[PDB]
Write an enzyme that holds these catalytic residues in place. Structure first.
Site, mmCIF file in Angstrom:
data_model
loop_
_atom_site.group_PDB
_atom_site.id
_atom_site.type_symbol
_atom_site.label_atom_id
_atom_site.label_comp_id
_atom_site.label_asym_id
_atom_site.label_seq_id
_atom_site.Cartn_x
_atom_site.Cartn_y
_atom_site.Cartn_z
ATOM 1 N N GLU A 183 13.936 -9.626 8.740
ATOM 2 C CA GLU A 183 13.734 -10.886 8.049
ATOM 3 C C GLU A 183 14.882 -11.859 8.323
ATOM 4 O O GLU A 183 14.642 -13.078 8.402
ATOM 5 C CB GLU A 183 13.564 -10.650 6.539
ATOM 6 C CG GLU A 183 13.427 -11.920 5.723
ATOM 7 C CD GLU A 183 13.212 -11.690 4.243
ATOM 8 O OE1 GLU A 183 13.406 -12.686 3.529
ATOM 9 O OE2 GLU A 183 12.826 -10.571 3.784
ATOM 10 N N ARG A 226 15.102 -10.623 -8.281
ATOM 11 C CA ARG A 226 13.914 -9.734 -8.283
ATOM 12 C C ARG A 226 14.191 -8.428 -9.061
ATOM 13 O O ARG A 226 13.283 -7.913 -9.765
ATOM 14 C CB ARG A 226 13.405 -9.459 -6.876
ATOM 15 C CG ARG A 226 12.258 -8.476 -6.834
ATOM 16 C CD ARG A 226 11.527 -8.466 -5.527
ATOM 17 N NE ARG A 226 10.793 -9.709 -5.260
ATOM 18 C CZ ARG A 226 9.577 -9.995 -5.737
ATOM 19 N NH1 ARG A 226 8.939 -9.157 -6.533
ATOM 20 N NH2 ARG A 226 8.990 -11.124 -5.403
ATOM 21 N N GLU A 281 4.979 -3.979 -0.494
ATOM 22 C CA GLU A 281 6.095 -3.458 -1.250
ATOM 23 C C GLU A 281 5.748 -2.800 -2.603
ATOM 24 O O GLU A 281 6.509 -1.926 -3.060
ATOM 25 C CB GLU A 281 7.086 -4.582 -1.552
ATOM 26 C CG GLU A 281 7.653 -5.337 -0.377
ATOM 27 C CD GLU A 281 8.319 -6.589 -0.839
ATOM 28 O OE1 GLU A 281 7.596 -7.554 -1.124
ATOM 29 O OE2 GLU A 281 9.552 -6.619 -0.970
HETATM 30 N N1 LIG Z 1 3.677 -0.715 9.319
HETATM 31 C C1 LIG Z 1 4.424 -1.532 8.568
HETATM 32 N N2 LIG Z 1 3.987 -1.828 7.328
HETATM 33 C C2 LIG Z 1 4.714 -2.659 6.534
HETATM 34 C C3 LIG Z 1 5.977 -3.211 7.047
HETATM 35 C C4 LIG Z 1 6.379 -2.792 8.421
HETATM 36 O O1 LIG Z 1 7.414 -3.170 8.977
HETATM 37 N N3 LIG Z 1 5.571 -1.986 9.093
HETATM 38 N N4 LIG Z 1 6.718 -3.963 6.201
HETATM 39 C C5 LIG Z 1 6.391 -3.935 4.773
HETATM 40 C C6 LIG Z 1 7.018 -5.040 4.013
HETATM 41 S S1 LIG Z 1 8.637 -4.791 3.692
HETATM 42 C C7 LIG Z 1 6.346 -6.166 3.658
HETATM 43 S S2 LIG Z 1 7.010 -7.442 2.771
HETATM 44 C C8 LIG Z 1 4.937 -6.430 4.086
HETATM 45 C C9 LIG Z 1 5.014 -7.766 4.835
HETATM 46 O O2 LIG Z 1 3.802 -8.186 5.395
HETATM 47 P P1 LIG Z 1 2.553 -8.603 4.433
HETATM 48 O O3 LIG Z 1 3.229 -9.734 3.695
HETATM 49 O O4 LIG Z 1 1.414 -8.975 5.387
HETATM 50 O O5 LIG Z 1 2.277 -7.287 3.716
HETATM 51 O O6 LIG Z 1 4.439 -5.358 4.889
HETATM 52 C C10 LIG Z 1 4.914 -4.039 4.529
HETATM 53 N N5 LIG Z 1 4.280 -3.009 5.302
HETATM 54 C C1 LIG Z 2 12.877 -13.024 0.758
HETATM 55 C C2 LIG Z 2 12.098 -12.266 -0.281
HETATM 56 N N1 LIG Z 2 11.880 -12.759 -1.522
HETATM 57 C C3 LIG Z 2 11.195 -12.069 -2.476
HETATM 58 O O1 LIG Z 2 11.024 -12.540 -3.603
HETATM 59 N N2 LIG Z 2 10.667 -10.849 -2.266
HETATM 60 C C4 LIG Z 2 10.866 -10.293 -1.047
HETATM 61 N N3 LIG Z 2 10.417 -9.087 -0.650
HETATM 62 C C5 LIG Z 2 10.851 -8.959 0.614
HETATM 63 N N4 LIG Z 2 11.535 -10.064 1.028
HETATM 64 C C6 LIG Z 2 11.559 -10.916 -0.017
HETATM 65 O O1 MOS Z 3 9.171 -8.690 2.059
HETATM 66 MO MO1 MOS Z 3 9.546 -7.099 3.194
HETATM 67 O O2 MOS Z 3 10.246 -8.162 4.359
HETATM 68 S S1 MOS Z 3 11.564 -6.914 2.519
#
Ligand SMILES: Nc1nc2c(c(=O)[nH]1)N[C@H]1C(S)=C(S)[C@@H](COP(=O)(O)O)O[C@H]1N2
Ligand SMILES: Cc1nc(=O)[nH]c2[nH]cnc12
Ligand code: MOS
Ligand SMILES: Cc1cc2nc3c(=O)[nH]c(=O)nc-3n(C[C@H](O)[C@H](O)[C@H](O)COP(=O)(O)OP(=O)(O)OC[C@H]3O[C@@H](n4cnc5c(N)ncnc54)[C@H](O)[C@@H]3O)c2cc1C
Ligand code: FES
Ligand code: FES
Ligand SMILES: [Ca+2]
Lengths: 162, 305, 758
Positions: free
Chosen positions: C232, C310, C691
């Site tokens: 990120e 958060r 998440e």
């Molecule tokens: N396979 C996979 N799934 C994953 C991730 C990843 O790197 N790889 N990142 C996770 C995280 S930390 C987040 S915030 C969301 C981000 O994408 P989305 O907003 O489309 O779920 O995917 C989640 N699932």
């Molecule tokens: C940047 C950021 N802001 C948020 O409120 N939640 C998150 N999850 C993962 N990345 C983020």
């Molecule tokens: O919102 Mo996942 O990139 S920490």
């Protein structure tokens, strides 16, 4: 200075000036242009670089097939050895291998970076044991990490082979 | 097969076809690194920046790859893969009577959640032993069992059982410079002989502080009276060590709650970690050296009855 | 219409065959060179000399870059508090100082290790406790504070107080950080291919370092082999250095980090120290609560402040606390800067919540399900920051999970097992979660799309979100196909790029599918309006007919879409206004068996019921539940980062750092998506899922704790209201040392005691 001769997906490789320090992963990706085999760690732990190796075992008759980490295999150990990579077993351009087809349709691949190695671990098992047990299948992947899937779907796609 | 010679920017690699060649190469170049699987040399080179300007690969040599059954045990050449050792011992264990395969099943227990198929298909028996990592999971089993090591240089040959003296210093063995490890005979267990091996789940530092052991008891015949007792541990010093003061005390004692107490007294003291000991987990590690002996103690009482 | 259907990930088969291209799988230019970072080996020191004489004679050796080679600016990072290359002082062990450029990656590694840096040490602050004591913080205290706190405590039958630590975590995305930078030779122009979740800030930080306008710099992202939050922002540490190499040499330059560099340098999840104090009734109803949170931030602000907001938003988990104060501090330490990691402060504060909740239950001698259920919000309740819970579905999840998992029967079998077993114990624990959906910084809840329809009727969708394995592009294609009413086969997404969609927020905060799905949906609607006259003229005709009629009538088949999450704006003063657009909810029940003599455990069975609204793709969504749960289980039980006293990471690879393996997962592993629970707040009645399910991995942790309680009833003492501190991760060390007995002891020995009981 002797010639190193090996095979990669059925194709003879004559390296006239092998450097002892060259790993097989470096040689596949950067000399041969075969980049399905991945770097995840460079230390034997993750399996992203998993290939199959074949050789005639002189003490057993038998050509034997086994898996190795391309990141730690010196190409200088591979004289008269046959290497099989993920691109050697199948492709979307031609025909997918059953291993490849199953891991994909089963939701066993998310980001995909670990998928080539898992495929080659599974492929190797099946070359040695065409009717594995469920147990043999799980132990096949001791050397392969996946950060995405939580493993359930991979093992599940593959129990179809048992 | 003819000897091959590859030459790089910094390293010469000789691929020996013949035992005779190797012993001559290693006599001319006693510095030369043997490489078999490279699963250790590759890590030393890449992550510790060791340059070894001369490599002999002895992997082609038959002798280093021989699997020989014998009256006292099963011998593996030193270049043999752990996957082969694993496979052969599994056959030995399914085939032979429980009382002959006690040690074998200890090796298999350490081999179980060891690396992965990829590593084991390339990692050599001899490479593990001569690497002499403090946290080697095999060398405690080999030492506690007196596993015989055939060692050759040009002219000389000898077979020694592994004991405490095979590891004098950190990352070092009692092979002379012109010498190589040829083969390893892992023994059948005798009547009134029981064996266990255990390992710590956690590893966390690169070559220290993972508790791992091999445990051997031989009783007087039909009895519970100790004739011999070996308990050897990795991850408690900079090398594989035997608890020799503690187990000597139990010769001719019986296998009871008093022996349990006295061995724990001995172990707590003889393997005692300073608070500043490399790797920490000072208390976890102590608890495991005792808890591992207690599992052995209880297993041995189950086998006795 | 494939919405609601379990469509495999669009790239899955090419991923299986090794035909999917990640950034280092891109061919090299004939002239393309290689970068390797040079990095501090000290926590806090002055740089005295750098000496590149030996690296210089290293074959194909090109140059060493440092602070002095930068044309524009050496000031970088989200809060302009980092250097691109360190100048006069180093402030952590992976702190980037310079970079070697060479003709092969092998040669760049060789040269990098032989660069001689001379240092003079300075006083270092490593632990949260060092920072608390030197008052070494970033910014001021964040706080949330509702009701009357002494009045709740005064009315309290019981008060328990304590301290808890939760360790950090490495992302261990299988693909490490990777950038390729191609300089064009004209007007400062540069084209970059990067493994990043943030193409906008890569584009900005590269432009800033170079002193060139943003419009010069093009960033492209096809896919990542994982990001999980760690791409990120910290991806720019590599991206920016590779760009300078490209600037300076005129040649294309690339870098892929090795694992050991990746874990040293690029930051991880925040460690948290909490000091807590709960006040509760004899029934187990909570009446007061106070928690002070400290995060270990590392040597730069990065996303640290926002992770703490958060945190504080989640300190209630699913529990109505009428009187409640939470605070938070960010500690400024000489460690690599910590960053986003899937959960973003939620897992840490939710783990603090569940820990005191577990203590309340034990203190009251009540069954833990009942104390938790008793304390749970009901539909419509306000939370501690004053936002109401509509569609609060945790009670359905609980019910259905209690029932589907056969919790009550398995409770007895666990008791029975512990009455009959001496040196092995079992634990069982059901745990809820709610996770708030939206970025905490409101201006990030914005999304763009660009859609083109070509004259063959084929559709190219571009949006501001990146694919890192989570099935975004699959879900956007499913939506486009539903919105346009064409087969998915007619729709393609190629990649993410700053020249198709500018000023995009990171693919983060679980909201991508919501916000990019909404932008994509609006492009589709504008395209349908533009096509309607031709549909009207030719109703029994085809999409291809209409698209051609619109082209030959000179109607445009290209359109932007955009979306803005409405009604967001929580204020910390005033303590009001919506922080989140909605909440995702779930419940996990986990059973374990510990080995009281070794520290090992088996994950025996886990059942999860997750509320994700109406799923766009229930295969992608169950896969997100599963991977998220297993990274949580890694966080709370396996994964342990360990440093030297002088601040240097020891654990820099898979051999010393243990992410879950194939054999780590529950023998019985069940995930269920809650039925009949549509979400009116997001695209096609769906919810964010990324998440939210990660904290549910704590259900294994509290199951292990319960199995320790049982071991300590057996061998350590007789008081069943005992509170012992178990920090995270509960490793074998922690598990074994807590199982106090004759060995720990030595009461066998003997002895003398003890506690040890006899
Ligand atoms: N396979 C996979 N799934 C994953 C991730 C990843 O790197 N790889 N990142 C996770 C995280 S930390 C987040 S915030 C969301 C981000 O994408 P989305 O907003 O489309 O779920 O995917 C989640 N699932
Ligand atoms: C940047 C950021 N802001 C948020 O409120 N939640 C998150 N999850 C993962 N990345 C983020
Ligand atoms: O919102 Mo996942 O990139 S920490
Ligand atoms: C991912 C990973 C996980 C691992 N996990 C474990 C584990 O859990 N437990 C464990 O015990 N090990 C583990 N290992 C270590 C592994 O077992 C050893 O590295 C391996 O057996 C060494 O064998 P090799 O053939 O690879 O040796 P090489 O690297 O080729 O050689 C190693 C050393 O042995 C010497 N050598 C080899 N043969 C001879 C000979 N015949 N005579 C004299 N010297 C010789 C070489 O000179 C060199 O010093 C792991 C390794 C990896 C990569
Ligand atoms: S790259 Fe990780 S095992 Fe080879
Ligand atoms: S699918 Fe991403 S690591 Fe396995
Ligand atoms: Ca975090």
């Amino acid at each position: 200075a002797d010639e190193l001769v090996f095979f990669v997906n059925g194709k003879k490789v004559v390296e006239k000036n092998a450097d002892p320090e060259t790993t097989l992963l470096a040689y596949l990706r950067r000399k041969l242009g075969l980049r399905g085999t991945k770097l995840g760690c460079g230390e034997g732990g993750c399996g992203a670089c998993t290939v199959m190796l074949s050789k005639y075992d002189r003490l057993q008759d038998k050509i034997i097939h086994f898996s190795a980490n391309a990141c730690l295999a010196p190409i200088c150990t591979l004289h008269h050895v046959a290497v099989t990579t993920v691109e050697g077993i199948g492709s979307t351009k031609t025909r997918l291998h059953p291993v490849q087809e199953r891991i994909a349709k089963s939701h066993g691949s998310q980001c995909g970076f670990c998928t080539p190695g898992i495929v080659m671990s599974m492929y190797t098992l099946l070359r040695n044991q065409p009717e594995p047990t469920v147990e043999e299948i799980e132990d096949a992947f001791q050397g392969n990490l996946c950060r995405c899937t939580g493993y359930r779907p991979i093992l599940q796609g593959f129990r179809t082979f048992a | 097969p003819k000897q091959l010679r590859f030459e790089g920017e910094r390293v010469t690699w000789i691929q020996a076809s013949t035992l005779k060649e190797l012993l001559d190469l290693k006599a001319q170049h006693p510095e030369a690194k043997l490489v078999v699987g490279n699963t250790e040399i590759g890590i030393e080179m890449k992550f510790k920046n060791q340059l070894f300007p001369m490599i002999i690969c002895p992997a082609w040599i038959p002798e280093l790859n021989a699997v020989e059954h014998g009256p006292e045990g099963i011998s593996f050449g030193a270049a043999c893969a752990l996957s082969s050792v694993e496979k052969t011992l599994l056959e030995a264990v399914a085939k032979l009577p429980t009382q002959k395969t006690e040690v074998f099943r200890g090796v298999l227990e350490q081999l179980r959640w060891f690396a992965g198929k990829q590593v084991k298909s390339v990692a050599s028996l001899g490479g593990n032993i001569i690497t002499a990592s403090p946290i080697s999971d095999l060398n405690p089993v080999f030492m506690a069992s007196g596993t015989k090591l055939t060692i050759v240089s040009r002219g000389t040959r000898r077979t020694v059982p592994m004991d405490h003296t095979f590891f004098p210093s950190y990352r070092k063995t009692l092979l002379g410079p012109e010498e190589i490890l040829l083969s390893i005979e892992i023994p059948y267990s005798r009547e009134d002989e029981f064996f266990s091996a255990f390992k710590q789940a956690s590893r966390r530092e690169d070559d220290i502080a993972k508790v791992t052991c091999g445990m051997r008891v031989l009783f007087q015949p039909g009895s519970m009276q100790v004739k011999e007792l070996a308990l050897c541990y990795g991850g408690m010093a900079d090398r594989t060590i035997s608890a020799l003061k503690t187990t000597q005390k139990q010769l001719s004692k019986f296998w009871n709650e008093k022996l349990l107490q006295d061995v724990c007294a001995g172990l707590a003291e003889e393997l005692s970690l300073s608070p500043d000991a490399p790797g920490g987990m000072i208390e976890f590690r102590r608890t495991l050296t005792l808890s591992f002996f207690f599992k052995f103690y209880l297993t041995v009482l189950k086998k006795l009855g | 219409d494939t919405v609601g259907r379990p469509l495999p990930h669009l790239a899955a088969a090419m991923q299986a065959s090794g035909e999917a291209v990640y950034c280092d799988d891109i061919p090299r230019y004939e002239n393309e060179l290689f970068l390797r970072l040079v990095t501090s080996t000290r926590a806090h020191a002055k740089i005295k000399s750098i000496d590149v004489s030996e690296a210089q004679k290293v074959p194909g050796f090109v140059c060493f870059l440092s602070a002095d080679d930068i044309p524009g600016s050496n000031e970088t990072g989200l809060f302009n508090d980092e250097t691109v290359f360190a100048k006069d002082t180093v402030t952590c062990v992976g702190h980037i100082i310079g970079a070697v450029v060479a003709d092969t990656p092998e040669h760049a590694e060789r040269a990098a290790h032989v660069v001689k840096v001379t240092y003079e040490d300075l006083p270092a602050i490593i632990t949260i406790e060092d920072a608390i004591k030197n008052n070494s913080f970033y910014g001021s205290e964040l706080k949330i504070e509702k009701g009357d706190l002494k009045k709740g405590f005064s009315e309290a039958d019981n008060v328990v107080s304590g301290e808890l630590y939760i360790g950090g975590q490495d992302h261990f995305y299988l693909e490490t950080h990777c950038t390729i930078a191609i300089p064009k030779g004209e007007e400062g122009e540069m084209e970059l291919f990067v493994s990043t979740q943030n193409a906008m800030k890569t584009q900005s930080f590269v432009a800033k370092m170079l002193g060139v306008p943003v419009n010069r710099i093009l960033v492209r992202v096809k896919r990542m082999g994982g990001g999980f939050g760690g791409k990120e922002t910290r991806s720019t540490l590599v991206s920016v250095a590779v760009a300078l190499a490209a600037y300076k040499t005129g040649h294309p330059v690339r870098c892929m980090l090795d694992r050991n560099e990746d874990m040293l340098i690029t930051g991880g999840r925040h460690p948290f120290l909490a000091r807590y104090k709960v006040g509760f009734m004899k029934t187990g109803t909570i009446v007061a609560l106070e928690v002070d949170h400290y995060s270990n931030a590392g040597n730069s602000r990065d996303l640290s402040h926002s992770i703490m907001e958060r945190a504080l938003f989640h300190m209630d988990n699913c529990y109505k606390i009428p009187n409640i104060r939470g605070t938070g501090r960010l500690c400024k330490t000489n460690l690599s800067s910590n960053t986003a990691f899937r959960g973003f402060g939620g897992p840490q504060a939710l783990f603090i919540a569940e820990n005191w909740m577990s203590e309340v239950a034990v203190t009251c001698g009540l069954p833990a399900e009942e104390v938790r259920w008793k304390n749970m919000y009901k539909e419509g309740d306000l939370t501690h920051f004053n936002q109401r819970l509509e569609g609060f579905s945790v009670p359905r999840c609980w019910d259905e999970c209690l029932k589907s998992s056969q919790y009550y029967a398995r409770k007895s079998e666990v008791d029975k097992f512990n009455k009959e077993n001496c040196w092995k114990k079992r634990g069982l624990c059901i745990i809820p979660t709610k996770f708030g959906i939206s970025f905490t910084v409101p201006f990030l809840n914005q999304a763009g799309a660009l859609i083109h329809v070509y004259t063959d009727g084929s559709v190219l969708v571009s949006h501001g979100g990146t694919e890192m394995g989570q099935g975004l592009h699959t879900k956007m294609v499913q939506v486009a196909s539903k919105a346009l009413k064409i087969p998915i086969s007619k729709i393609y997404i190629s990649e993410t790029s700053t020249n198709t969609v500018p000023n995009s927020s990171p693919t983060a905060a679980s909201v991508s599918t919501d916000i990019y799905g909404q932008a994509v949906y609006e492009a589709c609607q504008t395209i349908l309006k533009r096509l309607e006259p031709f549909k009207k003229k030719n109703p029994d005709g085809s999409w291809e007919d209409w698209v051609m009629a619109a082209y030959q009538d000179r109607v445009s088949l290209s359109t932007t879409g955009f979306y803005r999450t409405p009604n967001l704006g929580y204020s910390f003063e005033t303590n009001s206004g919506n922080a989140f657009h909605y909440f995702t909810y779930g419940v996990a029940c986990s059973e374990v068996e510990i080995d009281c003599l070794t520290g090992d455990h088996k994950n025996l069975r886990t059942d999860i019921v997750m509320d994700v609204g109406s799923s766009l793709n229930p295969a992608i969504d169950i896969g997100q539940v599963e991977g998220a749960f297993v990274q949580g289980l890694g966080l709370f039980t396996l994964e342990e980062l360990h440093y030297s006293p002088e601040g240097s990471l020891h654990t820099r690879g898979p051999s010393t750092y243990k992410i879950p393996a194939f054999g780590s997962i529950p023998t019985e592993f069940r995930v269920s998506l809650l039925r009949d629970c549509p979400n009116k707040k997001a695209i096609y009645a769906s919810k964010a899922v990324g998440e939210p399910p990660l904290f549910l991995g704590a259900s294994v942790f509290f199951a292990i704790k319960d199995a320790i309680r049982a071991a300590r009833a057996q061998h350590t003492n007789n008081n069943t209201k005992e509170l012992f501190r178990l920090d995270s991760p509960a490793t074998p060390e922690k598990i074994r040392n807590a199982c106090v007995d004759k060995f720990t002891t030595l009461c066998v020995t003997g002895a003398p005691g003890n506690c040890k009981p006899w």
